[PDB]
Design a protein around this nucleic acid. Structure first.
Ligand SMILES: [Mg+2]
Ligand SMILES: [Mg+2]
Ligand SMILES: [Mg+2]
Ligand SMILES: [Mg+2]
Ligand SMILES: [Mg+2]
Ligand SMILES: [Mg+2]
Ligand SMILES: [Mg+2]
Ligand SMILES: [Mg+2]
Ligand SMILES: [Mg+2]
Ligand SMILES: [Mg+2]
Ligand SMILES: [Mg+2]
Ligand SMILES: [Mg+2]
Ligand SMILES: [Mg+2]
Ligand SMILES: [Mg+2]
Ligand SMILES: [Mg+2]
Ligand SMILES: [Mg+2]
Ligand SMILES: [Mg+2]
Ligand SMILES: [Mg+2]
Ligand SMILES: [Mg+2]
Ligand SMILES: [Mg+2]
Ligand SMILES: [Mg+2]
Ligand SMILES: [Mg+2]
Ligand SMILES: [Mg+2]
Ligand SMILES: [Mg+2]
Ligand SMILES: [Mg+2]
Ligand SMILES: [Mg+2]
Ligand SMILES: [Mg+2]
Ligand SMILES: [Mg+2]
Ligand SMILES: [Mg+2]
Ligand SMILES: [Mg+2]
Ligand SMILES: [Mg+2]
Ligand SMILES: [Mg+2]
Ligand SMILES: [Mg+2]
Ligand SMILES: [Mg+2]
Ligand SMILES: [Mg+2]
Ligand SMILES: [Mg+2]
Ligand SMILES: [Mg+2]
Ligand SMILES: [Mg+2]
Ligand SMILES: [Mg+2]
Ligand SMILES: [Mg+2]
Ligand SMILES: [Mg+2]
Ligand SMILES: [Mg+2]
Ligand SMILES: [Mg+2]
Ligand SMILES: [Mg+2]
Ligand SMILES: [Mg+2]
Ligand SMILES: [Mg+2]
Ligand SMILES: [Mg+2]
Ligand SMILES: [Mg+2]
Ligand SMILES: [Mg+2]
Ligand SMILES: [Mg+2]
Ligand SMILES: [Mg+2]
Ligand SMILES: [Mg+2]
Ligand SMILES: [Mg+2]
Ligand SMILES: [Mg+2]
Lengths: 159, 296, 211, 145, 169
RNA sequence: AAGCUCGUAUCAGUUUUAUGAGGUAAAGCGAAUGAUUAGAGGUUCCGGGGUCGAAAUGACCUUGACCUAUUCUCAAACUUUAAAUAUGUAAGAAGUCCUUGUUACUUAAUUGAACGUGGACAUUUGAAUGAAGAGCUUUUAGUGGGCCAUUUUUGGUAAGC
RNA sequence: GAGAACAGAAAUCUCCAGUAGAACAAAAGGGUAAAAGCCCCCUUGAUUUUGAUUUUCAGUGUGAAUACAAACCAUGAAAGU
RNA sequence: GGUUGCGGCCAUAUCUACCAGAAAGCACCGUUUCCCGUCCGAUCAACUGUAGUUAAGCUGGUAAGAGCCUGACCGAGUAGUGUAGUGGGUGACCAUACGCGAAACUCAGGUGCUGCAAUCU
């Protein structure tokens, strides 16, 4: 018959990273979590208690609870044509703070700056991001750089 | 090493080195994990350890907490400090260990404010008792013993350190069954024995007992007790006053120093061999093949 | 009772090795892969000619074997048993299955039927090394072996010195130098990396940079 | 398909303007087999707008044909003539988004000359009609306009 | 160079391998007790041989490790039986040495037919000071080559004090 | 089907940017495990053979095993590495900063944690493209034999299987 | 690997080396080295109360599991578990 | 700069061989009355800091060293891959078009960085 137990198919996924077995380094436990914090989820196969199920591997969620040795993360799983709210009781060894918002926060803190630093000068801001623009005109020189002229090569075998 | 031993490309390549503080045989991480970590719903609350360590005859007590950048000393006290308070000999014995814990306790409790409130037992009959929180007032400063790699044996002196930090006012949760004078075959402490070790009655008793059965040995060890004219009896008063001295001013004095940071630096670079440049290494090889190869 | 090769020419399945999981599998009909003067030195046989696949397919172990015998047979009786070194460069590690035959198509998983080497385009099947003065004789060997194999394969003169990894001059430059030292039937090269000490032990005739 | 929609190309032979950036460049990348595009000249942007330029006004797709219609809906951003329109497109103005979305997608007839080529759904570069054909876009559109 | 990289004896360990338990063993035990002053340890068979007539966990031998001045007496007292002549084997590569003697009577110790007669294995293990490095709990390192006990150095050591012979090639 | 509450709003089978997850393809095997061709050099008080022999913990040949450095070839249920395509989250008014209330939780501690009161900054307010709008509710039919094409793919010699 | 009477391929003793090549009831795969393996000490948390959550999912049930709350205990110097 | 106690990242910290280490510190080291543990005061416990030593630990340096880390238009725009066609081919398979793009290789460079507290010519 088929087999579909909890940790089925997880051979490599909960595996441990080459030359990285054993105790987990202590910073994993010194890290601190508050409600609203965005975490990324990754099972540490060495820690059997408080493990996320495989589906939640590589998923990012929001902390909704802080307990003695765990955080409660809430993920939106989409079953069917729709999302439902799922709540995960994970031990701290399976969670890390996401940097998925660091660029936003770095962006905002910095947008406050050049916004004041412009206003208090004489307006003219421009602080929405823009995509890669096509490049502009330019003049490439030959001085020290005459064009080398390549042709295609014959067929050869070397073996 | 031996030829048929030795390691291969393969062996070394797949080798997972331990940590370092474990390679070094210094840190037990299994205990550290369970000493340091905090209840996650207590957020940035430090989890202070009373770290007691025994060098080949110095006693280190640092109240220490943890930061992911590396740990943190709230306060330190070393039993080499004991001369300031009237202790010059045997600073690695049980009673030195008590004294230093007593030092550490008063010292931080001092720099924390819980100084006048929370004295802990001043009397000291070696009764079993941890410091009790004051009805309407600050809970006491709570701290957990970091034995380290010490073995837990009943009588061990690492628990001596504990007894004075606990007598000093610290809350350091503990059971009575590893203090000297704990009855193996009845769940019961003899308090006269533990008062003895706190005051060093076991050392003085050795002193008295050798002063008529053997002065060959009594002169070799206990030499300094001669040279400063301190036969046994007086030993407990030494420590009874050391307790006074310590409580009456624990505030720590740094060494007077002499020679700046700058100086220690330079005079120790004299003995510091420095690395070599690859151009230098080239010239050592090319030289080596001029010599070793070119038919002498 | 062997099926026609036709039934297994293409690489339709994934590699089915002999394994814990397989086990009861017949022997590979081809069992020697180096014949002729294989003890010979690298210096002995400069010229090297290859039999080279022009197809993504599967060669039987039985046709590997038959071919092997064909070329070795020719090469010896025309130019002697010590003339040449023939290396079958291809090992038949993939087990082919068979649905031998109350039932019909219900539960049809084959039992091991025979072996086959799976072979790329450009992949070398045979390799031969000799004296230049034997080229024709060798090429005729591989040409006749061809008739033993499904699919098109083509014979190609190497630029390299024997079974070495070096074209003819670059090996020469390395040799008429000091860097090369004879081994069993292959050779060892002086590395510029590693312990100067036991690097000097080996390769004495380097470290003057001349003859 | 989704992208073909976001570019408002929902029936065959209809066309729109696109401002090039990485973030639209990829879009074109994704739909090369189904479209032909290139760089339009002042000439063909002009004759697109003069002959088949309709605005979107409470939807409704209204024909241009009088400058009051543009001023009415685009005047907010400067822009109060059919030529003020054309200018904003060709020079990719600071209000090109508004300027360009205002135009209904152009609805071209099939090319009058024919397609060049005997089979359309290969790349221009292989003798077919789809892909970036750069400045050769103008010859096509002009046959289709 | 040498100050206190001397060459003490680590421990002496005697062995009486008796393919069985019960009387014949505990008598062999009594031999090691009245010969060592310490009370001996017993060894269980590790598996089962039937040609040796032994069951897993049987108790099958006894032995005792003896350190300090006490070692030197037993060492010499048996080195007596060996007439101060050993062989170029006996000395391990790692610097220890051992020998056998049948009949424990040949080294002080009377007879008593209630006990019987037993053979003994002698195994002297040597080391220098600072072997503690390898043996303490904390900062457990290893000993530097220029301080590890070697065969050469022990045979020498043995030849000097005792003034016994090494023999063979 | 019936609608209902709202409406530039909020929406997306799409891109971009930032930040994760993954062990397939390829690759690897003078890297682990497991297979595989070949010699070469070593090592035996010691797997056996053979000559000298009274033997030898003897010497000398020998063929095996092991060792060292090499060589040819492989893996759905091997692997250090490791794609493309797919895939999680984020891109603000439910935001950012200041001041300093509540509690029985929590801290040595008005420490923290949570929830706040008062104050400061508007549409270049925080990427693209689109939006014949968005959100929500009830009730009910038919259906619950499927077949095909490109690509990936299992069994089978194969099949319009 | 090297050493020790009877003792041998295999008994018991020692030392060196040893990334786990072992062991953890059992299929296999994860995992584990001052341990998760081996030896010893003390034990019943394999307990009491009723909810939440993850897998399978209809987001029913059942099985199994996870993190808490309220008890009562075990162990340990203790943090803890 | 050294060293120690506590560390963080956990090999540029590991491994093999050799040499060098002032001062303090660590260490090895002496003892067995006392608590405590052993077949054995080797480990573990206690006492001395007295009687001794840098030999070992430890720290550092050397090595066309093993390993490991980093880099590069080194290999390679190769392998593989998303997309396209009434493209080639009997097939097996293979070119082409708009994109994404490895691994081994080869060559160079490197061999612990660092937080808190105390101490030190
Ligand atoms: Mg299955
Ligand atoms: Mg490990
Ligand atoms: Mg469990
Ligand atoms: Mg080896
Ligand atoms: Mg190598
Ligand atoms: Mg512990
Ligand atoms: Mg295929
Ligand atoms: Mg198939
Ligand atoms: Mg039938
Ligand atoms: Mg059939
Ligand atoms: Mg069946
Ligand atoms: Mg079957
Ligand atoms: Mg053919
Ligand atoms: Mg090669
Ligand atoms: Mg558009
Ligand atoms: Mg015309
Ligand atoms: Mg016409
Ligand atoms: Mg015409
Ligand atoms: Mg046609
Ligand atoms: Mg027209
Ligand atoms: Mg010395
Ligand atoms: Mg027997
Ligand atoms: Mg999506
Ligand atoms: Mg898989
Ligand atoms: Mg593959
Ligand atoms: Mg392949
Ligand atoms: Mg690879
Ligand atoms: Mg392999
Ligand atoms: Mg694979
Ligand atoms: Mg996406
Ligand atoms: Mg938007
Ligand atoms: Mg729009
Ligand atoms: Mg609308
Ligand atoms: Mg319905
Ligand atoms: Mg229905
Ligand atoms: Mg049904
Ligand atoms: Mg129905
Ligand atoms: Mg179709
Ligand atoms: Mg298992
Ligand atoms: Mg531990
Ligand atoms: Mg039960
Ligand atoms: Mg259920
Ligand atoms: Mg079940
Ligand atoms: Mg000194
Ligand atoms: Mg005693
Ligand atoms: Mg001692
Ligand atoms: Mg001790
Ligand atoms: Mg030295
Ligand atoms: Mg040290
Ligand atoms: Mg190197
Ligand atoms: Mg190709
Ligand atoms: Mg492709
Ligand atoms: Mg085709
Ligand atoms: Mg190609």
């Amino acid at each position: 018959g088929k087999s579909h137990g909890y940790r089925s198919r997880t051979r490599y996924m909960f595996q441990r990273d080459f030359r990285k077995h054993g105790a987990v380094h202590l910073s994993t436990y010194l890290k601190v979590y508050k409600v609203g914090d965005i975490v990324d989820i990754k099972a540490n196969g060495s820690i059997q208690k408080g493990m996320p199920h495989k589906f939640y591997q590589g998923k990012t969620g929001v902390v909704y609870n802080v307990t003695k040795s765990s955080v409660g993360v809430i993920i939106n799983k989409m079953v069917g044509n729709r999302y439902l709210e799922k709540r995960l009781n994970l031990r701290v060894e399976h969670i890390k703070h996401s940097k998925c918002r660091q660029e936003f926060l770095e962006r905002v803190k910095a947008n406050a700056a050049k916004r004041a630093e412009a206003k208090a000068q004489g307006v003219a801001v421009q602080l929405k991001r823009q995509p890669a623009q096509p490049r502009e005109s330019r003049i490439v020189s030959t001085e020290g750089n005459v064009p080398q002229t390549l042709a295609p090569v014959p067929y050869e075998t070397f073996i | 090493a031996f030829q048929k031993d030795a390691k291969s490309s393969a062996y070394s390549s797949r080798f997972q080195t331990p940590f370092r503080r474990r390679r070094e045989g210094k840190t037990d991480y299994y205990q550290r994990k369970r000493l340091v970590t905090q209840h996650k719903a207590k957020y940035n609350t430090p989890k202070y350890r009373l770290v007691v360590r025994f060098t080949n005859k110095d006693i280190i007590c640092q109240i220490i907490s943890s930061t992911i950048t590396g740990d943190v000393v709230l306060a330190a006290a070393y039993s080499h400090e004991l001369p300031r308070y009237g202790i010059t000999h045997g600073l690695t014995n049980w009673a030195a260990a008590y004294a230093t814990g007593l030092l550490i306790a008063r010292r931080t409790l001092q720099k924390l404010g819980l100084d006048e409130t929370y004295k802990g037992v001043e009397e000291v009959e070696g009764e079993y008792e941890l410091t009790e929180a004051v009805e309407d007032g600050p809970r006491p400063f709570k701290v957990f013993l970091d034995i380290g790699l010490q073995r837990t044996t009943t009588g061990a002196r690492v628990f001596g350190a504990l007894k004075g930090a606990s007598d000093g006012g610290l809350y350091v949760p503990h059971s009575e069954n590893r203090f000297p004078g704990w009855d193996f075959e009845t769940e019961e402490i003899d308090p006269e024995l533990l008062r003895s070790y706190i005051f060093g009655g076991h050392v003085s008793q050795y002193m008295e007992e050798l002063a008529d059965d053997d002065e060959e040995r009594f002169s070799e060890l206990f030499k300094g007790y001669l040279a400063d004219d301190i036969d046994a009896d007086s030993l407990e008063d030494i420590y009874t006053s050391a307790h006074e001295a310590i409580r009456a001013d624990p505030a720590f004095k740094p060494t007077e120093k002499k020679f700046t940071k700058e100086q220690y630096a330079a005079e120790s670079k004299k003995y510091r061999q420095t690395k070599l440049s690859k151009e230098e290494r080239a010239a050592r090889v090319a030289a080596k093949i001029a010599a070793l190869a070119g038919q002498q | 009772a062997r099926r026609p090769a036709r039934c297994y020419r293409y690489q339709k399945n994934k590699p089915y090795p002999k394994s814990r999981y397989n086990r009861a599998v017949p022997d590979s009909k081809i069992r020697i892969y180096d014949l002729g003067k294989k003890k010979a030195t690298v210096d002995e046989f400069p010229l090297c000619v290859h039999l080279v696949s022009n197809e993504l397919e599967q060669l039987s172990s039985e046709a590997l074997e038959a071919a092997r015998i064909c070329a070795n047979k020719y090469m010896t009786t025309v130019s002697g048993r010590d003339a040449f070194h023939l290396r079958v460069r291809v090992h038949p590690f993939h087990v082919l299955r068979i649905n031998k035959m109350q039932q019909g198509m219900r539960g049809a998983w084959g039992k091991p039927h025979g072996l086959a080497a799976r072979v790329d385009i450009g992949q070398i099947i045979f390799s031969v090394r000799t004296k230049d003065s034997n080229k024709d004789v060798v090429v005729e060997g591989l040409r006749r072996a061809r008739y033993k194999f499904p699919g098109q394969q083509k014979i190609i003169l190497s630029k390299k010195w024997g079974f070495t990894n070096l074209d003819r001059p670059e090996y020469l430059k390395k040799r008429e130098a000091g860097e090369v030292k004879d081994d069993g039937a292959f050779v060892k090269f002086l590395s510029k990396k590693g312990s100067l000490e036991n690097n000097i032990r080996e390769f004495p005739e380097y470290f003057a940079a001349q003859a | 398909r989704k992208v073909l929609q976001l570019l408002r190309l929902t029936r065959i032979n209809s066309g729109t303007f696109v401002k090039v950036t990485k973030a639209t460049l990829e879009l074109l990348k994704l739909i090369e087999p189904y479209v032909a595009y290139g760089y339009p000249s002042y000439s063909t942007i002009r004759q697109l707008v003069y002959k088949r330029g309709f605005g979107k006004i409470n939807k409704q797709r209204v024909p241009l044909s009088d400058n009051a219609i543009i001023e009415a809906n685009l005047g907010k951003y400067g822009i109060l003539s059919i030529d003020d329109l054309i200018h904003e497109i060709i020079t990719v103005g600071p209000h090109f988004k508004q300027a360009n979305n205002f135009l209904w997608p152009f609805k071209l007839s099939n090319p009058s000359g024919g397609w060049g080529v005997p089979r359309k759904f290969k790349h221009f570069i292989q003798g077919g009609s789809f892909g970036n054909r750069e400045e050769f876009i103008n010859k096509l559109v002009k046959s289709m306009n | 160079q040498n100050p206190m990289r001397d060459l003490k004896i680590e421990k002496l360990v005697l062995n009486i391998s008796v393919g069985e338990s019960g009387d014949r063993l505990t008598r062999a035990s009594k031999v090691l007790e009245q010969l060592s002053g310490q009370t001996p340890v017993q060894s269980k068979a590790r598996y089962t041989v039937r040609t040796f007539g032994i069951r897993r966990n049987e108790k099958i031998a006894v032995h005792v490790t003896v350190r300090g001045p006490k070692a030197e007496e037993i060492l010499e007292r048996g080195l007596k039986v060996k007439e101060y002549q050993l062989r170029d084997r006996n000395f391990s590569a790692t610097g220890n040495f051992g020998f056998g003697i049948d009949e424990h009577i040949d080294l002080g110790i009377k007879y008593d037919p209630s006990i019987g007669i037993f053979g003994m294995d002698f195994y002297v293990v040597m080391n220098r000071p600072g072997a503690r490095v390898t043996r303490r709990k904390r900062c457990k390192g290893t000993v530097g080559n220029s301080h590890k006990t070697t065969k050469e150095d022990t045979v020498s050591w043995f030849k000097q004090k005792y003034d016994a012979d090494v023999l063979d090639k």
